[PDB]
Amino acid sequence: VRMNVLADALKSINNAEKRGKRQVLIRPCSKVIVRFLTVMMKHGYIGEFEIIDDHRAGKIVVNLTGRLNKCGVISPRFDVQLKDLEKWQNNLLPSRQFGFIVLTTSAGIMDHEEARRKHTGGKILGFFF
């Protein structure tokens, strides 16, 4: 059965990007998916997006610009502390110059570079580059 909705959303975008398609449809929608998409959009990796109401959790249509190399999920939501975050970005990123880990923290869902300014740890959700 469907054990996790965020893993479907990112796998669906990742297969559409590799085929060269200009749009994709995500279903079911969730509060976690809308907040994750917003972090990719603010850094310039995807275009703007629209939500459809249907009285059953809803759907999203997203616009693609061709810049995204990958996006992905870490399935157990492991806890991270500021001293251990260096080991995770050494494992998951392609260079020290670009790409982002996404964390959930009591100050909100955010970019791993913002978590250092806000002096906060959290749980891992995923990444993009």
Partner 1 sequence: MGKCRGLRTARKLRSHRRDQKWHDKQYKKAHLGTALKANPFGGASHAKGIVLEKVGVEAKQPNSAIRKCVRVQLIKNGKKITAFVPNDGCLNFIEENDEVLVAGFGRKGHAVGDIPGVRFKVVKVANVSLLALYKGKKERPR
Partner RNA sequence: GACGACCCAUUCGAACGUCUGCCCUAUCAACUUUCGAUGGUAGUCGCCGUGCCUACCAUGGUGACCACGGGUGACGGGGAAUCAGGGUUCGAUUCCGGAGAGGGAGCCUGAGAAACGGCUACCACAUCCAAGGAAGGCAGCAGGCGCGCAAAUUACCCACUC
Partner RNA sequence: GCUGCAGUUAAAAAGCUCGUAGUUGGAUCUUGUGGAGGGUUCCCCGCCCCUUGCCUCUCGGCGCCGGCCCGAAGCGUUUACUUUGAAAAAAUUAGAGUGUUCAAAGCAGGCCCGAGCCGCCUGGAUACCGCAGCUAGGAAUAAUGGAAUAGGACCGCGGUUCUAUUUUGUUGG
Among RNA, partner 1, none, what does residue 2 contact (CB within 5–8 Å per kind)? RNA
Among partner 1, RNA, none, what does residue 101 contact (CB within 5–8 Å per kind)? none
Instruction: Give Cβ neighbours of residue 103 (< 8 Å, ≥ 6 apart).
Output: 80, 109, 110, 111, 112, 115, 121, 122, 123, 124, 125
Task: Identify which of 68, 69, 51 has the alpha carbon closest to the alpha carbon of residue 60.
Answer: 51
| Contact range with partner 1 by CB under 8 A, out of 5-13, 47-55, 70-78, 89-97 | 70-78
Sign of CA dihedral 91, 92, 95, 98: negative
Q: Among residues 77, 87, 116, 118, which is the contact residue for partner 1, using CB under 8 A? A: 77
By the rule CB under 8 A, 76 interacts with partner 1: yes
Q: Minimum distance from CB of 3 to partner 1 (Å)?
A: 10
Q: Minimum distance from CB of 103 to RNA (Å)?
A: 8
Q: Minimum distance from CB of 9 to partner 1 (Å)?
A: 19
Crossing angle of the two packed helices 5-18 and 31-43, in degrees rounded to 10: 40
